[PDB]
Amino acid sequence: SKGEELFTGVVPILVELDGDVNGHKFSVSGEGEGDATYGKLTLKFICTTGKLPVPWPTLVTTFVQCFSRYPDHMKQHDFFKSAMPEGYVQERTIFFKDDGNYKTRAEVKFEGDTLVNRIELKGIDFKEDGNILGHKLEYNYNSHNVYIMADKQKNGIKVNFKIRHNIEDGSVQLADHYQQNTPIGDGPVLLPDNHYLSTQSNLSKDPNEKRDHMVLLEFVTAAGITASTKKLSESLKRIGDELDSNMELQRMIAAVDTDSPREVFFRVAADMFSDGNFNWGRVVALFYFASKLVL
């Protein structure tokens, strides 16, 4: 990629956000630098509209995956960099469980020597007493894996992952992310095989800063890419897939009386084997059953 030659050495980063969550508007400006070579990000965010409506941790993901470190044997699956300097568009939808959602659209591109992230975000359906709008999130972060996948039809990628937020009672607010990327530029881009980005982050405060702010450090590394063994697991995939997605079956098992579970399994077991034609397929399909007799 021609983009790859932009990401050697420390690059300056600048970030602009306009947010709107349950009619709370707000703006964030961020600056810093990223070192792709060692998969390193450092960024400072100032709330430019006063205090922040939402907790800081909720925005970490919204606020540069072109600064991930790609190992040499992988560097031909780096879509992010390959899209530069013209850049890409990053659209996400973020479902917090039992609560509202964000919908974002960013343009990431180069404006001279600087890499800028320009974001519009729009939250709705939050619960005034919830984890978000109640500010019950802990000022911290965890590590996640960012499964990428090509979208050869739309010349971009499809991304998905699930962020865990800590809360003070020990519980964990889930944040189901559905992401999609697409080149603003007309030039060709790398369209990757399935792999992931292993992310780690910590959140801190500057002690000579009195406005509402977050100091964000990100670590990012690409991974998950090491025959005909390929062709085999593609099938094992679909067989377990059609299985877990077979709406007939899922409905059928949910619909069962399992307060007195022990009898229910045994009779269904013995009913399966009334024709007495045992094969490993049934041993397993009944072990998916005895499996499902847990949750």
Place this chain on the structure above:
Amino acid sequence: SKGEELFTGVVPILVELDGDVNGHKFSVSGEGEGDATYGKLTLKFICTTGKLPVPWPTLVTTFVQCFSRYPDHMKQHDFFKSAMPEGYVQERTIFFKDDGNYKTRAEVKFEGDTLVNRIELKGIDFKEDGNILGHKLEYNYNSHNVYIMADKQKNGIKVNFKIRHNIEDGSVQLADHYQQNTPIGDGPVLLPDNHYLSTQSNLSKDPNEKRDHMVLLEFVTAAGITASTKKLSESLKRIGDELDSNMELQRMIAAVDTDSPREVFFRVAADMFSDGNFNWGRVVALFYFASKLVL
């Protein structure tokens, strides 16, 4: 059934067989009595043509399942008795693994007070040094479950099971039995739900008999019958069924290099999860894989 009333008390039994195994002909006459009340059978067999060309054990199953004890709660799934006194026809095929086969047709019915089994048997493809024609079966028997299933279209029953014959070196000769029963009469019969007959047997000699003979003692008891739980396992059945019968998949897995198996599993495991979308279906489909990495 009206047939049931004929099988209270001890019934005299008469058995006639005409055989041909690799162009070896032979005949067998058997007499004894049967007690369906306590599922009991005693029979003596004389070879009327000199010595027997096959081992006695191979002939036990060929040589009255209307003498099975049906527990009270089952007596309506008793097909065999219900077809009497007019009778039924019992056709089998018997694949000795790695070896020849028997193809039988027998008419079982009443002739006055006696219950007669009249048999023609035809064996082809045995090995002149095999387990049968070489006579390497031990003079004994083991216990087996005889799975029955209605055949509503043919007004009879399908039957299948698998006899294990002991051999001297400790190994075991399989005898895959494929059976079917059909009423000679036009009267109505009973068409059973899936159940099974639990058979136990012992083979002996009479010490005042000098002709080639077998003394056969059989015990036979029906079993395997105790909702919407029915409808559920019908599906679990087919899902494990299509699975084990999916010729694509079976071919695919057989076609794999498993002398160095440990790597093969792990990479296929990690290839399945390169898109990192885990669901129990795949956990199980890969546990059918790691399963199959045994035989």
Place this chain on the structure above:
Amino acid sequence: SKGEELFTGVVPILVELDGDVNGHKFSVSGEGEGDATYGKLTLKFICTTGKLPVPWPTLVTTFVQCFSRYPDHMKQHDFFKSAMPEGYVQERTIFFKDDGNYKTRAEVKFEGDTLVNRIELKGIDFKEDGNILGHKLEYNYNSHNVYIMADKQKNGIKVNFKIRHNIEDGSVQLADHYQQNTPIGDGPVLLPDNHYLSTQSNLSKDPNEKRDHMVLLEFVTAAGITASTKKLSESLKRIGDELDSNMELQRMIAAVDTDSPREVFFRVAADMFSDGNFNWGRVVALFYFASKLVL
């Protein structure tokens, strides 16, 4: 053994019993014959004192394990025959679960050509509405493995096994059998390695008998014998043994609140691994725990 030569061919059998069950006395005489060559037993029992106070099935085991077929490779671990013609003494205790017990002593030996079993039986602690004294046993039998073990110190054998009696409601009455055999004679006997007798049995009536009777048919075959591999499993034995018998632990686990079980396991799991020193021993000891979180 010289005893073995007495058990070729059909031997006449005679059986005498004197009983006392909850102050109910009774007597039983049985005659038949035994064929050790094909492990075969046929016996008829008359109640000489009118009706029987107990169900017939309870008495089957009390009512000739010297008629078991020992395969050629085993015939040196045949204790029963080797003690003949002088004989042996067979003492049992029989705990019906949730119920009374039989304490028997029998002398089995030859008196000329006949093999006699002479029995005194004494039952206490039954329930006047129980499974026995209430007569709720079904007139049938199941198949059992009779584990034998040498008792080199007492020049005899220890024996133990567990009979399952069928009852009408579908439940099953256990009969925990604790046996021991000891030669009346001074001659040398055979002291067996661990093996077992595979028994199968059927109970019936004679239709020209008007007195209270049982017709008993037994099949009995020795089995369970095929290095330094011996020495290994002796240890695996004790390790699982001390484990299951460790009264500290058994008490400890029984003493746990498992109405809300899911949390209990996880915390104990995480408490085991707070020092974070994982080894397979703990993976297994916790898999004995998660195991025990079932019954």
Place this chain on the structure above:
Amino acid sequence: SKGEELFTGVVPILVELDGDVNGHKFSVSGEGEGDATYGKLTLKFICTTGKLPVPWPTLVTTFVQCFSRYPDHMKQHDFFKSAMPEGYVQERTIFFKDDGNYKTRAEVKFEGDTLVNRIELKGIDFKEDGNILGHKLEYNYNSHNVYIMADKQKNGIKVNFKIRHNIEDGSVQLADHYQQNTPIGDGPVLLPDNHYLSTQSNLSKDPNEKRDHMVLLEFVTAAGITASTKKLSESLKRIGDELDSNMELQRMIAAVDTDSPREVFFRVAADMFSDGNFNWGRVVALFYFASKLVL
């Protein structure tokens, strides 16, 4: 703790090392700052003796666990801070697998407003062609958990963990760390319950620095602390412990012929059950066996 009040707000850090590895001497000086409040470390190392004998990654651990972030419910198990300002002594031994070892002794204490780490390190027995002295380690790092444990007898703590180093061929150099801490000061210190430190690190280069150097960013958080459920798992611990440490047994199983493994298991299985006294203990002890029939 009185030490806790020293670690609010950004503290300056200064590090001195004198190393000697296979007669290669060297010196490292490091400076930077740590923010305990958010479990954050930033440090720069300059090689003051020229080029470095050993790879940079090998020293990360040697080069401030008093800057870990302790959650409020844990802050009474913070030994590190409690030992301040007088400080503690940190002794480690580091076994790299299939290669040499480091032995270190540091004094960590306050010298005015600064937290200084003073280190003597001494490596021996490395292989001139190895992963270390050959420089085959990758300039990166992974995440680890740092299991702490009190040593109430020696008024300090015992620490242990296992660092994985990446190598270019995809393989992983292990670094078994055995650590121990002890107050230079005579004042009392907190002696913790079992918990761990979750560490994450990345390694980078300053682009305006021409001497041999590492930029080290560490993230550190305490965790692993959430009844009578305590007392239970203490036992499950020892039972799986004595088990995995029982040298009799471990020797015994290693000593077995497992090129033809299938027979070996089955016979040992059948030998365990020749007395036919099944209990869950043996089911598990044999499932530790069938377990061990893998590696």
